[PDB]
């Protein structure tokens, strides 16, 4: 089997991407944030505290003939950005782009933090990291991909995120028309539960490539590119007037600037992030200070190849017995 679904930016900045997902019988379609940095499929629901729902579409398990309470199971998750959610668990039928999993754990939120409430466009998350990170207790549950894997034509999924445009998540096949050149594969460590890999270096604009190992994670659920302070300083030094602002919470730059590209290495291959992908717009409405899309990972504890990086590539998440990651230009 295979599946193919379009993923759409939630706003004009590409802050996140939503993908329609069918849950239950008859189908209830919710727009979920596919997150390769976490491993829980959770949704706004009829159980979510009413004051914490503001415009989201909810899953109502009592209206699904295939829903079953997973008795005694609870979940609770906290994300790198400080947001959180928790609740109980159902199993139900879940379909993405025509690919169906029966008995998928659907984690129903009883509580969500303010950032989730305030984002009316995201109805929940669909985790695509390794199932070892799943938070369900006392019996850990499998991700949608883990459950689908054996049925797929090939044990892979791909992320093809758009810049200010829709893109695609495919399951079970590699669309050879969706990228240019060849796909370069690179080793993955699953020790921390992430799609963790080592970039071979970077360049800023038309500058020379610096060969240096940068360990980080491929994370579709993180907006920005978070890299070591040395690398980030080297980037922003090429933008007149750019500075790190403790009050704003990162590097800002004059909105009048033209940003240089940023290149990262994948083995001997190179992925180029155009400068415009690094512009996250005014820090507040009407400001002439703009927020940068490359930020320091210092104090996160891990480097994160988030959407800024991933949307410059066609990315293969290879879930073979020994997982790997592939990157192609597009």
């Amino acid at each position: 089997s295979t599946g193919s679904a379009t993923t759409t930016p939630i706003d004009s900045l590409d802050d996140a991407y939503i993908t329609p997902v069918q849950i239950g019988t008859p189908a209830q379609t919710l727009n979920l944030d596919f997150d390769t940095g976490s491993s829980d499929l959770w949704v706004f629901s009829s159980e979510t505290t009413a004051s914490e729902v503001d415009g989201q579409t909810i899953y109502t398990p009592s209206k699904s003939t295939t829903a079953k309470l997973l008795s005694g199971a609870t979940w609770s998750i906290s994300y790198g950005d400080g947001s959180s959610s928790s609740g109980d668990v159902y199993t139900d039928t879940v379909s993405v782009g025509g690919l169906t999993v029966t008995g998928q754990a659907v984690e129903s939120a009883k509580k969500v933090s303010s950032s989730f409430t305030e984002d009316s466009t995201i109805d929940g998350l669909l985790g695509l990291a390794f199932s070892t990170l799943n938070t369900v207790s006392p019996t850990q549950q499998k991700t949608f991909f883990d459950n689908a894997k054996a049925s797929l034509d090939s044990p892979v999924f791909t992320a093809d995120l758009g810049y200010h445009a829709p893109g695609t998540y495919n399951f079970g096949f590699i669309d050879t028309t969706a990228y240019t050149g060849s796909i370069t594969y690179t080793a993955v460590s699953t020790k921390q539960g992430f799609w963790e890999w080592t970039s071979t270096g970077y360049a800023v604009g038309s500058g020379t490539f610096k060969s240096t190992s940068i360990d980080g994670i491929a994370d579709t659920g993180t907006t920005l590119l978070y890299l070591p302070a040395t690398v980030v300083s080297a980037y922003w030094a090429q933008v007149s007037g750019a500075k790190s602002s403790s009050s704003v919470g990162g590097y800002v730059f004059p909105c009048s600037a033209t940003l240089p590209s940023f290149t990262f290495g994948v083995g001997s291959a190179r992925i180029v992030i155009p400068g415009d992908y690094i512009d996250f717009g005014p820090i507040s409405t009407g400001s002439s200070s703009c927020f940068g899309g490359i930020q320091s990972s210092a104090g996160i504890g891990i480097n994160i190849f988030g959407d800024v990086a991933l949307k410059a590539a066609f990315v293969v998440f290879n879930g073979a017995t020994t997982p790997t990651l592939g990157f192609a230009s597009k």
Side-chain angles (χ1 to χ4, degrees), residues 1-62 64-67 69-109 112-141 143-148 150-190 192-242 244-330:
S1 63
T2 64
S4 182
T6 299
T7 192
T8 302
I10 65 167
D11 63 23
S12 66
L13 299 177
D14 297 347
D15 282 316
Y17 297 79
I18 50 172
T19 309
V21 177
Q22 283 71 49
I23 310 177
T25 310
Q28 299 179 40
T29 299
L30 274 66
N31 296 328
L32 305 187
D33 184 351
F34 283 24
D35 181 13
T36 64
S38 70
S39 306
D40 287 50
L41 192 175
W42 74 260
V43 297
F44 279 78
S45 75
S46 57
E47 302 180 327
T48 310
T49 301
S51 65
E52 296 179 351
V53 184
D54 188 4
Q56 296 81 9
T57 296
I58 63 166
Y59 169 58
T60 303
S62 65
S64 174
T65 59
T66 42
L69 179 72
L70 186 63
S71 183
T74 59
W75 62 280
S76 180
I77 193 163
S78 299
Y79 296 101
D81 68 353
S83 67
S84 63
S85 52
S86 62
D88 56 16
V89 187
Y90 293 81
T91 57
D92 209 341
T93 302
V94 173
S95 300
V96 176
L99 170 65
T100 301
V101 168
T102 57
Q104 174 64 46
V106 177
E107 303 173 33
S108 169
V112 303
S113 64
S114 61
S115 180
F116 288 115
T117 300
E118 292 161 1
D119 186 359
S120 66
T121 71
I122 291 175
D123 302 324
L125 267 64
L126 189 150
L128 293 168
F130 292 88
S131 293
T132 54
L133 294 182
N134 176 267
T135 78
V136 177
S137 180
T139 307
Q140 191 172 60
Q141 301 294 303
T143 70
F144 175 82
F145 177 55
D146 207 345
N147 283 322
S151 302
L152 296 177
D153 291 356
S154 181
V156 306
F157 68 91
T158 64
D160 181 8
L161 302 179
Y163 168 65
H164 293 355
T168 306
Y169 282 102
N170 290 330
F171 293 81
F173 72 106
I174 288 160
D175 179 357
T176 61
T177 72
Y179 58 87
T180 61
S182 50
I183 306 176
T184 297
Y185 290 86
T186 195
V188 165
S189 172
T190 64
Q192 297 192 86
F194 300 123
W195 293 91
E196 186 173 2
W197 64 290
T198 302
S199 173
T200 50
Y202 70 98
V204 176
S206 60
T208 63
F209 187 85
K210 176 70 171 182
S211 290
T212 183
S213 294
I214 305 295
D215 181 291
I217 66 167
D219 185 1
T220 58
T222 290
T223 313
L224 307 185
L225 174 53
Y226 295 88
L227 291 173
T230 47
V231 177
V232 175
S233 182
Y235 179 80
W236 290 109
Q238 297 304 309
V239 180
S240 298
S244 183
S245 168
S246 52
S247 60
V248 175
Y251 281 89
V252 297
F253 67 93
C255 295
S256 60
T258 301
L259 296 177
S261 64
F262 184 89
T263 300
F264 63 95
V266 182
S268 57
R270 305 290 179 252
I271 299 294
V272 180
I273 306 171
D276 294 339
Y277 290 26
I278 298 159
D279 177 18
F280 281 74
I283 61 170
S284 292
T285 303
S287 180
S288 72
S289 185
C290 275
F291 198 69
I294 296 177
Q295 296 294 344
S296 179
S297 64
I300 293 177
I302 198 161
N303 301 304
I304 306 172
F305 293 87
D307 298 333
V308 165
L310 302 182
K311 74 179 85 167
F314 177 88
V315 187
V316 181
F317 295 79
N318 170 28
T321 305
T322 300
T324 65
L325 272 172
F327 293 82
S329 295
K330 67 186 183 191

